[PDB]
Every structure is written in C-alpha cells, then in structure tokens.
Design a protein around this ligand. Structure first.
Ligand SMILES: CS(=O)(=O)NCCN1CCCc2ccc(S(N)(=O)=O)cc21
Ligand SMILES: CS(=O)(=O)NCCN1CCCc2ccc(S(N)(=O)=O)cc21
Lengths: 304, 304
C-alpha cells in the first residue's frame, strides 16, 4: 500500500539524451534512430527570440553548425529540417540505445513523466499532468529546453512532450515530437496568455478512489448526486465538467471499491463546498488532480 | 523556475534489477559486480514469516535453490551468504551494467529515490525521505521487496535502502545494503511500533527558501526569532529541534535569498501557529519536509 506521485523509470529515455549546440546556444536533443529532435529556438540568439523569423534564421545554418554530442562522442550531422517548432537533425549513426518508441499527442488532463536535462545530461525525473489549459507546472531552468515528457507501456516509450519555454507566469509550454505546440503558445519571447486553468475532475475522483483503497476514507459520506448537480458545483469551483466517458473510465475503480461513481462525486461535492477542515487525504491537504484513472489502477496493481 | 518532487534518473539502477526466486517466493534483487543482494525473507514461506529462524531456514537452501533472473537470462549462483537481513548471492557473471556505486547508510531526514520493482522489473520512481522515526512512506505492493533507494552524484550511485516490509500502519521499513534495518524493525510478521514521527524542520526551511526563490513569498513576515524560542514552538508542533548544524547547512540558501535563517524560522513559527489560511506554498497546502537543503540547491541550480 501507499500512494506516491510516481514517474516512469527513465532509463530508456536517458539513453536518448544528447546536447545540441548551434552558435552560442546549447539545449537538449532527443536521439531516436538516426534523427536528433530539438527545439528550433536552438538557432536563435538573444536578439532573435523577441520576434524570430525561423525560416530566415535556419537558412544561415548548415549541417556543420549543429553540434550534437551524445555523452562524450560527437555525432555527424548529414541533414537538417524544421518541422513546425522542432528541428530534425539527421545524423549518420543510429542510436544503439533507441528503445521501441512512438510519438503521441496527449490530451489535456493526461499525465506523463519528464526527464529534466541540462547539456544533454539527465538531472531528475518527475510526474506531471498536461493542464486543461495546455501548460505544465514543471521544474525547468535555463538549458532545460529539449527535455522530454513520455509514457512507457511495457517496452514502448511514447514521447509526448518537448519543453520549449517558460511563460512570464512561471508555467511551462512545449510541443509534441512533431513540433506542434500544446495550446496557443508560440516560440517567441513575448507575453502569452495561458487559458483559465481548471481542475481535472476525473483525476481527482481517481485519486479519491486511490485514497479509499489505501484506507483514507474519512471523506466518504451518506450522500449521492447526479451528473448535472455535480457539474453545477464543478463549474462553481472551476473543475472540468464530468462526462459519461469519465464515469466509464472510472468503472474499474468503482468496481474494485464498490463505491458508485456518483457517490464518489457526492463526496467530492462536499469536499469542494466544506474544504478538508484541516485534514489530509493521501498526505495531501488539497485535492490532487495529477493522477489519471489509469495511473491509479497501474500503481494500485503493480504494473511494470 | 518551478519546484517539483524530483527523483534521480533511474537508468543506472534499472540495469541492476533482477528477479530472485526461492521456493515459491519471488522478490527483487540488486545485481552489482558478481553479487546479487536481496531481502533474506526470500527463503521464508507464509508459515515462517511469523517467527522465522533465518539461520535454520537458510541451511535447507543450496546455491541451486536461488533462482536469479536478469531480464530473460538466468544467472548461475556459485555462493550464498546472509549478512544481517540481506542475502548475498555470488553469481558467476559480473553485471555488465554495474555503475560506479557505494553502499551508504543515510541519516534520518535525508532523501532518496526509490525504484519500485516487481519480478525484477522497474515500474516507477519516486523521491521520498527517511522519516526521523526510520520509516518511509512509499508505495509498495506484494512483490516490491528488494526494491532499492539510492542517490546519484555525477556517475556514482549511492545505494542507501532496500525494501523489506510494510508495517500494519501502512508505513515501510527496510535496510541499508549491509542488511541492517533502519529503525527498530525486525524481518518478522509481527506488530511493530514505529516511533513518534516528527517533521524534518531543516527540510521545511529549505523548502520555504525554494518557495522564495520561485516567487511564493506571502508567508514572509516582519518578524524574527531565536533558536531557543523557535525550538519551543517546534516541540509543540512535533518538529525536529533546529540545531546550529542545520542553520549552517541552510547557509547557501540564506545567502542566495538574503533572508537570515532565524528570520525564515519566524515565518515558519507563524505558519505553525496560524496555519496557511487556505493558501498554498509551491502548490502545497501543507508544510513540505521531503526536500533537503541539498535538494533545493541542486534543483534550483540544475545539477546534472
Ligand atoms: C530565459 S531567457 O533568457 O529569456 N531565454 C530565452 C527564452 N525564450 C526562448 C523560447 C521562447 C520564450 C518564450 C517566453 C519567454 S519569457 N519568459 O516570456 O521571456 C522566453 C522565451
Ligand atoms: C504481505 S504478507 O502476505 O503478509 N507477506 C509477508 C510479509 N512480511 C514479510 C516481511 C516482514 C513482515 C513484517 C510485517 C508484516 S505485516 N504487514 O505486519 O503483516 C509482514 C511481513
């Protein structure tokens, strides 16, 4: 028992991290097969980042200007192309440590592990959620760009995120591995508004199920509710509206605990309206929304 | 910016995880050089765990009874010995993925990453603290025994923990890599009292410094205190007494922020006495104690 914010083991991704230097800028790259993927802003200087013309900037760069270093060995760049906001550097060597992988674009509310890197070197791993407003609340300092987010299913690594920037609000923005930003963000040093963020309701309910499984049951009450009545309360507290699809995904947890989804919603409604009264749930004094129903099932059953 | 409960990249430890089977019991082992380390309770059956005589139980076991499997290849066991609560299985092959490593016995209050494993396979990684009462609040299900805790300094993995058991209270107990339990715990299926746990005061102060560095400054006040006055309050709220050694370790954070340690203590005193008034610090509604002053410095400076 016990419930932790667990990240995936990062080994398969560590073997893909490289350092990419272009001019005076150095960030992280992802080496899969014979391609190195990195944020296209590696070609910008401090003057450029304010209003960069990436097409014009990339034209002044040749294969020999992209310095890709894997650990201590230098990779030979034989091709360069820009796909949306990522650069794809074709190298002459396939990464011998390339795991089985997919590029996937996650949905808001889904979770993933981030391997924070600097100079192509991994420093730490943590689990986070793609916020409903398409930002992530990570831990990224200068040089962390090109650090990636992923999920692991047995031997397959699904890369879902590449870090590009920190907004003036301190939240983080990035792209999928095809270089498409999550959200309305652009790779430009300009003030950018992240949408109104909401709490991922289905994840909070999944976490309440995880709490019941582990013994924290004080919040369970003698009440029930309807999807419509629950959503009136969810709207008032800036929670994502619960849909029947969310109820269906909570099915296995509802089955395991014997607590109907709408009964769990009534507990959540009471917690939203009354607060925690100084108590904690799974060692937390707030309602946790960065565990999906799949995370709860995996953790609560020991999926390796 | 941003502050996350970051674990070390687990790759160097993933390459050391093996499955160890003895009779009908299977748990995790740690393969370093030509030795596989695992909990000695791998030799117990369900009857044995209540009052095991490990010396007598191990005598009925020969090298051929310990089944050690690394991924998909079987290891040949050529020696077996018990050192405190761990078994050391000498294998005929040195692990080609053995990183530079040390066995270290951590102090209470220190942090480490845990690579939770099942059947020798890594499922997730998380950061935790060795509680002042020598327990850890982990996430461990049946089969997780033999999962290890570690710290990483550049290329050196310092193994500090091996999981052995869950107490009836749901907290976790284990040993250092020499098989010595942290705390008063024994590897016996009997009710065992963990001491009164206290909050790691120096870690809370380190985390308040991390908050100031990231912009959460609402808790800073116009007050100061003394070590003696602070400790009167720390005792009332079951916080570890702050020593000059703790003040000295907070030195770099105090220097970076320009907030004297005793001034930070006055803020903490006010938070202990008034609560958070519904506010959060670094996205947390309680005082976090699982970040050491070294963790804060490393994270806030990007140490890889
Ligand atoms: C952190 S730095 O010295 O400004 N380097 C350039 C970062 N830089 C490139 C990537 C795009 C981007 C977007 C926003 C912003 S910010 N935080 O609003 O100034 C900076 C930015
Ligand atoms: C989890 S199990 O089916 O009881 N397997 C034996 C575990 N088992 C071996 C390791 C030592 C130990 C210590 C305490 C306890 S408990 N939680 O108090 O029963 C069980 C225990």
């Amino acid at each position: 028992s016990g419930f932790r914010k667990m990240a995936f083991p990062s080994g398969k991704v560590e073997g893909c991290m490289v350092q990419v230097t272009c001019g005076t800028t150095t960030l992280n790259g992802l080496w899969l097969d014979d391609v190195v993927y990195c944020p296209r802003h590696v070609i910008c200087t401090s003057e450029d980042m304010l209003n960069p013309n990436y097409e014009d900037l990339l034209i002044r760069k040749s294969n020999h200007n992209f310095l890709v270093q894997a650990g201590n060995v230098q990779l030979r760049v034989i091709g360069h192309s820009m796909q949306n906001c990522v650069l794809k550097l074709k190298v002459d060597t396939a990464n011998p440590k390339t795991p089985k992988y997919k590029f996937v674009r996650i949905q808001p509310g889904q979770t993933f592990s981030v391997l924070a890197c600097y100079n192509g070197s991994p420093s730490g791993v943590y689990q986070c959620a793609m916020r409903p407003n398409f930002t992530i609340k990570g831990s990224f300092l200068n040089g962390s760009c090109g650090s990636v987010g992923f999920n692991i299913d047995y031997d397959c690594v699904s890369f879902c995120y590449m870090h590009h920037m920190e907004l003036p609000t301190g939240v983080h923005a990035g792209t999928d591995l095809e270089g498409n930003f999550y959200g309305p963000f652009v790779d430009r040093q300009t003030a950018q508004a992240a949408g109104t963020d909401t709490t991922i309701t289905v994840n909070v309910l999944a976490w309440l199920y995880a709490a019941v499984i582990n013994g924290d049951r004080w919040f369970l009450n003698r009440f029930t509710t309807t999807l419509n009545d629950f959503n009136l309360v969810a709207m008032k507290y800036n929670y994502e509206p619960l849909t029947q699809d969310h109820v269906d995904i909570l099915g296995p947890l509802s089955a395991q605990t014997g607590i109907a989804v709408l009964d769990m919603c009534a507990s959540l409604k009471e917690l939203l309206q009354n607060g925690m009264n100084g108590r904690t749930i799974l060692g937390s004094a707030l309602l946790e929304d960065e565990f999906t129903p799949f995370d709860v099932v995996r953790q609560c059953s020991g999926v390796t």
